[PDB]
């Protein structure tokens, strides 16, 4: 079996410029009938995969002409000009010239966009989780750029280790930006212990740290 | 238009067998081919086969010789992907695809089907609120979600307010706890105006356990 090889592995990119994405093959795609069987598909976070090239350098129907292939042989390119926010995901090529098609490994496009600063939420546990025996206290950093952020847990001004779990969502497809959940997990016996739960953020778009806090039963 | 709908997400033990539909419309059935294509989780996409629903002739990549077999339903516009003796390796979300020869490519794909293969049992959520950061008489946002908590296995469904809100949602990805459930947090942001004049109810859908809840969030 011939193999495809694409590279980068991962493409950041500024909104407006130029992305391209290349497409190896160790045998030549071009079919003894004079076709070259090399396609792009585009799987957007959370979505199916969507066919955006065929045969090198037609645009599918609806796919905008910022999309164009090129190459022949061996290597073929896709390139993306003015690049827009929705292009974001992981970019595929296909060969079907040899049996049995195959895909190259995708090229995750991510955007590069200005720093954005997170606005902080806390959320207390809920009666109805405490009267089935555990407490979650939940930070939400909705809307930041870039992902890295350092959240810190503080329970009556005690830094917490070990006891939250976080998550990311994938950058928004309109502004590109990220958002994050920390979760702190206590028993209701722990929780109950204490008074002041808060949740301390530090980020580049932060001039200093952003905390926010609750008295529980407040 | 176009359109090829799967089945439900599965939870299966090892050793199982396993069969997911894929129902075609919008087109002539037997004019085109129907390839099924894995995607193991935060992998590439690989190519398993096609099957003609002209001739009937099924064609396996190298991989997916054995216990793969793809069945078709002609009258019912339905193609099939069944999985003998399942593994651990088996552990993918499958996608079917419609095959067009006449530039030999795929063109409309599915939504695609979760498989689990695992010796462990469902475990339906716990969907708990996230009560709205302000009142009503305060400015600007207000947050506020649901915390659909220990659940096994992946996926649930969430949306507010049946689908018609959509706007400034954020669905976290599923993390696993030290108990090996899974967890999640849905949140939405909204005009904190509205806190007293809009209710907010999120629906949560953990179809291998049968679990739909809708929760209520209010302040």
Known sequence: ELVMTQTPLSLPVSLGDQASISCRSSQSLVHSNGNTYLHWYLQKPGQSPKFLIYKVSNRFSGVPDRFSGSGSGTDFILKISRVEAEDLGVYFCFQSTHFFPTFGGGTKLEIKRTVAAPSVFIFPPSDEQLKSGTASVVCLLNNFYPREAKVQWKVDNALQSGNSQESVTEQDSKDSTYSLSSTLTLSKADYEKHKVYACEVTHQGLSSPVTKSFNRGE | ?219
């Open chain 2, 1 to 219: 238009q176009v359109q090829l709908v799967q089945s439900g997400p599965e939870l299966k033990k090892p050793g199982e067998t396993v069969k997911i539909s894929c129902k075609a419309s919008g087109y002539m059935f037997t004019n085109y081919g129907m390839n099924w294509v894995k995607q193991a989780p935060g992998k590439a996409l690989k190519w398993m086969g096609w099957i003609n629903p002209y001739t009937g002739e099924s064609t396996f990549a190298d991989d997916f010789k054995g216990r793969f077999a793809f069945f078709l339903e002609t009258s019912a516009t339905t193609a099939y992907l069944q999985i003998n003796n399942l593994k651990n390796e088996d552990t993918a979300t499958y996608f079917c695809a419609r095959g067009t020869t006449i530039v030999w490519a795929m063109d409309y794909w599915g939504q695609g089907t979760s498989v689990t293969v695992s010796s462990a049992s469902t475990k339906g959520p716990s969907v708990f609120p996230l009560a709205p950061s302000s009142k009503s008489t305060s400015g600007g946002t207000a947050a506020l979600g649901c915390l659909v908590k220990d659940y096994f296995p992946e996926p649930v469904t969430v949306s507010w307010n049946s689908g018609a809100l959509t706007s400034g949602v954020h669905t976290f990805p599923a993390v696993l706890q030290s108990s090996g459930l899974y967890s999640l947090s849905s949140v939405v942001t909204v005009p904190s105006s509205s806190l007293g004049t809009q209710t907010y109810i999120c629906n949560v859908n953990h179809k291998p356990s049968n679990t739909k809840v809708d929760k209520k969030v209010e302040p």
